[PDB]
Design a protein around this ligand. Structure first.
Ligand SMILES: Nc1ncnc2c1ncn2[C@@H]1O[C@H](COP(=O)(O)OP(=O)(O)OP(=O)(O)O)[C@@H](O)[C@H]1O
Ligand SMILES: Nc1ncnc2c1ncn2[C@@H]1O[C@H](COP(=O)(O)OP(=O)(O)OP(=O)(O)O)[C@@H](O)[C@H]1O
Ligand SMILES: [Mg+2]
Ligand SMILES: [Mg+2]
Lengths: 27, 242, 240, 32
């Protein structure tokens, strides 16, 4: 049991600026 | 191989996907056993088991009986092991029984060693009980079922999935700005994502009301075709044992 | 009045509705405390609480601290009590702490008796733990949240609901004959079904990603209006 | 905790319900 393997390292920037929840996990 | 399916939260489609995937593997020539490990005992209803049929592997254990007598044959190559119907007293008092069910693990481990099935699929509940953890440990591979929404997005950053699980999207339909944003985000960031998904499809909503797996109910539905693709992917990638 | 909200299965919209109903009750002039009784600790994210903010009533109780110091002020009318963030190990071993939380029941009983809030709304998980049972026992009323599908249809014939609960439909949508069939059947047979429902609505999907209650996020969203209808009904029928 | 109050007495009276019960074996099962 472990946390999912998530790698946050063009239109993603739009989604991140649209949604504060998504920006939070991404940085 | 033993395959666990477990939603990242309730209601994401785990039981319908389990029944459909079992049907698809059976159609590909595999002998399949499907086991319901959820106390809800809902899986049986995708296989035309009467609601008043109370027997199941766990019901049999609690009643001091043989869990092997609770199996049901759907086709010559697909067998079913329901959980069994719990009374309301039992439902709201899990401490009276969730420690007395550990015999199912050595029973299934023996069944696995016998090789009578090519696939044992286990519909697992979204709880952390001992019996869920133990059944998870018997699985060779596992599918973590999600829908594309902000709730599942949060859960993927804070809760554990079974180790080595792949993530299977269910109920997807483009058109929602926020869901498409999450989806594109997962595509670039979720390393355990499967290359196929299951679309929202009224065949997947209707087949439970018809008490059938989606592939028997409407074989040319898009979701049935997608479940078939998952079945072929399992045969190719999930065939090895732990 | 203490109002419990509990899905009949996971994922039906209980938490989003709890945050939205609290906001609506506030817009109607009421004082509200919202309590997250779910270990998933998701309610706080509808109120712009930082994901990394780990405090909450259970987190404090397990850490040997005063659970009453974990409450947060959202507006002058709306306070929030998160559950708190459990570690992975805690999440996978509920037996290690589920009995260490029983003081919340007496604590919430004190709060109820004080009349500090006009409404306490409790987002309740769908487990059979003693604490879920005891929190339900201090609720004056409760809403059982459903979606119109074959799964919830079966559940309503086999599992217990909180005594006196009314049934609230969420996620009602266009394009499903089987949904419409089950719905028409419920209208003739489900005695505790509420006379209003909530549709699937892009605002209910977006407001969590914007970290706001639906009525703050889009005050003129159809779903915000549907929640307001629910809030008015609660004022009229659930005030005792 | 109690099971939901469900009454199927007045079901077989509207043709819209009768067609749905014929369509869906799951619903007919609980109603009869
Ligand atoms: N892809 C889909 N398209 C449309 N409806 C779907 C789809 N997948 C599932 N459903 C419907 O969603 C409901 C819940 O599905 P299901 O019971 O498989 O989910 P679950 O995760 O196992 O639920 P539970 O939390 O009760 O165990 C059912 O009515 C089912 O018919
Ligand atoms: N009416 C609706 N229309 C569209 N999206 C909705 C609606 N209601 C809820 N959602 C979305 O569904 C997801 C699950 O909702 P929510 O977290 O409120 O459900 P829940 O029953 O509390 O879930 P859980 O089992 O995690 O406690 C969220 O991403 C939410 O934004
Ligand atoms: Mg299920
Ligand atoms: Mg919730």
């Amino acid at each position: 049991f472990s946390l999912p393997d998530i790698d946050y390292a063009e239109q993603l920037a739009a989604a991140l600026k649209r949604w504060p929840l998504l920006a939070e996990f991404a940085q | 191989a033993v395959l666990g399916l477990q939603g990242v939260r309730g209601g994401v489609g785990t039981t319908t996907i389990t029944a459909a995937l079992a049907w698809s593997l059976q159609m590909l020539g595999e002998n399949v056993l499907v086991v319901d490990a959820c106390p809800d005992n809902l899986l049986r209803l995708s296989f035309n088991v009467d609601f008043t049929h109370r027997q199941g592997w766990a019901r049999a254990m609690l009643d001091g009986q043989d869990w092997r007598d609770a199996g049901l044959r759907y086709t010559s190559q697909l067998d079913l092991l329901p959980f069994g119907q719990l009374s309301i007293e039992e439902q709201e008092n899990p401490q009276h029984w969730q420690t007395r069910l550990s015999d199912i693990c050595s029973g299934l481990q023996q069944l696995k060693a016998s090789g009578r099935y090519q696939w044992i699929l286990i519909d697992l509940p979204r709880d952390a009980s001992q019996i869920t953890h133990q059944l998870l440990s018997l699985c060779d591979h596992s599918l973590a079922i999600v829908n594309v929404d902000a709730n599942c997005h949060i859960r993927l950053h804070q809760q554990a999935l079974p180790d080595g699980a792949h993530i299977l999207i269910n109920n997807f339909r483009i058109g929602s700005q926020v869901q498409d944003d999450i989806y594109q985000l997962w595509l670039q960031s979720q390393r355990r994502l499967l290359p196929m998904l299951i679309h929202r499809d009224e065949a997947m909503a209707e087949c439970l009301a018809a008490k059938q797996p989606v592939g028997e109910y409407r074989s040319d539905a898009l979701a049935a075709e997608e479940i078939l693709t998952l079945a072929n992917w399992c045969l190719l990638n999930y065939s090895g044992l732990k």
